[PDB]
Amino acid sequence: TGIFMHGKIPTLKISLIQIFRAHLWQKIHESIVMDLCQVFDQELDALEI
RNA sequence: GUGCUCGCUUCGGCAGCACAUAUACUAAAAUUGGAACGAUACAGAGAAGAUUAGCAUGGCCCCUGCGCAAGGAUGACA
């Protein structure tokens, strides 16, 4: 994940590992990329793409 | 090597004499081997109970039925 830990806070590193389990950061990035691709696809005649 | 012997002997030289007394891992070079938790690659919830559904058994208290043993009170003229 893109979380930076400013100090070993063990009671928070675990709660952040739980939240971003199963590669949630990568899936969020992929989902946003795909949603932007779709919106640019629906607008390609007016946008001259 | 320096200096000296009344030495041979000549200043071209020779013989002897005093001092000098035992350094070095010694090494400039020879070669072929075995090698990360450093990177990238993979995984990554990197600390939880490792569960909850029935029925029957076991304990206590009644009720009913059957059996065993030992008994109590009562009833019946022609």
UniProtKB/Swiss-Prot annotation:
Widely expressed. Signal peptide: none annotated. It is found in: Nucleus; Nucleus speckle. It is linked to Retinitis pigmentosa 13: A retinal dystrophy belonging to the group of pigmentary retinopathies. Retinitis pigmentosa is characterized by retinal pigment deposits visible on fundus examination and primary loss of rod photoreceptor cells followed by secondary loss of cone photoreceptors. Patients typically have night vision blindness and loss of midperipheral visual field. As their condition progresses, they lose their far peripheral visual field and eventually central vision as well. Plays a role in pre-mRNA splicing as core component of precatalytic, catalytic and postcatalytic spliceosomal complexes, both of the predominant U2-type spliceosome and the minor U12-type spliceosome. Functions as a scaffold that mediates the ordered assembly of spliceosomal proteins and snRNAs. Required for the assembly of the U4/U6-U5 tri-snRNP complex, a building block of the spliceosome. Functions as a scaffold that positions spliceosomal U2, U5 and U6 snRNAs at splice sites on pre-mRNA substrates, so that splicing can occur. Interacts with both the 5' and the 3' splice site. The MPN (JAB/Mov34) domain mediates interaction with TSSC4 and SNRNP200. Has structural similarity with deubiquitinating enzymes, but lacks the residues that would bind the catalytic metal ion. Contains a region with structural similarity to reverse transcriptase, presenting the classical thumb, fingers and palm architecture, but lacks enzyme activity, since the essential metal-binding residues are not conserved. Part of the U5 snRNP complex. Component of the U4/U6-U5 tri-snRNP complex composed of the U4, U6 and U5 snRNAs and at least PRPF3, PRPF4, PRPF6, PRPF8, PRPF31, SNRNP200, TXNL4A, SNRNP40, DDX23, CD2BP2, PPIH, SNU13, EFTUD2, SART1 and USP39. Component of the U5.U4atac/U6atac snRNP complexes in U12-dependent spliceosomes. Within the minor spliceosome, which acts on U12-type introns, interacts with PPIL2 and RBM48. Core component of U2-type precatalytic, catalytic and postcatalytic spliceosomal complexes. Found in a mRNA splicing-dependent exon junction complex (EJC) with SRRM1. This is Pre-mRNA-processing-splicing factor 8. It comes from Homo sapiens. The gene is PRPF8.
